[PDB]
Design a protein around this nucleic acid. Structure first.
Ligand code: ZN
Ligand code: ZN
Ligand code: ZN
Ligand code: ZN
Ligand code: ZN
Lengths: 74, 70
DNA sequence: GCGCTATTATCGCTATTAGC
DNA sequence: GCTAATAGCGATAATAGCGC
């Protein structure tokens, strides 16, 4: 009866086995120890949808600033 | 009908404290940025995200047209 | 770097609500 | 009275991370 349980801590803290604060997008542990941008988290099954949404919202936002920027250029 | 528990706690099947802007369950697990509450029915929301999908496609197409014309 | 235990988090099942 | 729908518990699988 395995449970598909994915760690919420970041890969580095997990690999190093240290305390993870879980800060996004990069945790304070990684930042405090000089590997901030090496910090990332595993995708959660129950987060996929909420992620798809956040990202999609960001894309419409940036794509629109882009249409405006391009137009406001040529 | 519109659920009172944030979508994540719903999917996680845990009790939501329904605190805003983000509940403590999401907060504590580090996913507060993904914590949100529904403002409309599931049908209304699904339809909204469907239109977003299409508008997105049309945008990516417009940017190509625009830049690939610059 | 990792072993070992404390604490956490998944998912089947139960309790409760909504509806016929 | 009964079946579906939604919420949410809780047993236990499995991580978190202290401390060596
Ligand atoms: Zn971390
Ligand atoms: Zn970075
Ligand atoms: Zn990190
Ligand atoms: Zn919640
Ligand atoms: Zn939440």
């Amino acid at each position: 009866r395995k449970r598909n349980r994915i760690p919420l801590s970041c890969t580095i803290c997990r690999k190093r086995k240290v305390k993870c604060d879980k800060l996004r997008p990069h945790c304070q542990q990684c930042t405090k120890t000089g590997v901030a941008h090496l910090c990332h988290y595993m995708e959660q099954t129950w987060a996929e949808e909420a992620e798809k949404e956040l990202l999609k919202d960001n894309e419409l936002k940036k794509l629109r600033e882009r249409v405006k920027s391009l137009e406001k250029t040529l």
